[PDB]
């Protein structure tokens, strides 16, 4: 699956979306630099409206997961 397609479900817990996201990104055939860029660019962008609202308002992965 392309990492671009991993999007948080409307009722999916943020931790579960994070898990799916990292699993898919680990499976992508890409350099570590490209994978890092994808985490900074897609993780908040592909979150559902509720979590996007909280995340934008703030950042580490551990701060993101607590805020949601």
């Amino acid at each position, epitope marked *: 699956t392309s990492i*671009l397609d991993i999007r948080q479900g409307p009722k999916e817990p943020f931790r579960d979306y994070v898990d799916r996201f990292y699993k898919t990104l680990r499976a992508e055939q890409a350099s570590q630099e490209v994978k890092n860029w*994808m985490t900074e*660019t897609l993780l908040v962008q592909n979150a559902n409206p509720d979590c996007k609202t909280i995340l934008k308002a703030l950042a580490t992965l551990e701060e993101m997961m607590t805020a949601c």
Partner: nanobody
Amino acid sequence: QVQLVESGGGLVQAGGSLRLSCAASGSFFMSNVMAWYRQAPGKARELIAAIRGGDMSTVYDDSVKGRFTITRDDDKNILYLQMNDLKPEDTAMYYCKASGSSWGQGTQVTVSS
């Protein structure tokens, strides 16, 4: 399945250039992040370049740095991959991708010598 459509592939000698285009006329497809992938027969489809709208940040695989440039034209809704200084190792099918798009048929790049 908004399906993206790649074009601009061709047959060129090593050192030459190409420009791939990706579009879906009549479709609402440009996502905040877009990427180009490439796949040689029987090999993993690899993520080689990506761009993010707004700040226009870009990232590239080490094998294409300083040779390829990903750009997007927001008015025309076209994503491009400029390819300079081509190498036989660049020979592959190239695919573009947006968040939620279906995979296109790709465009073939063949580099001789």
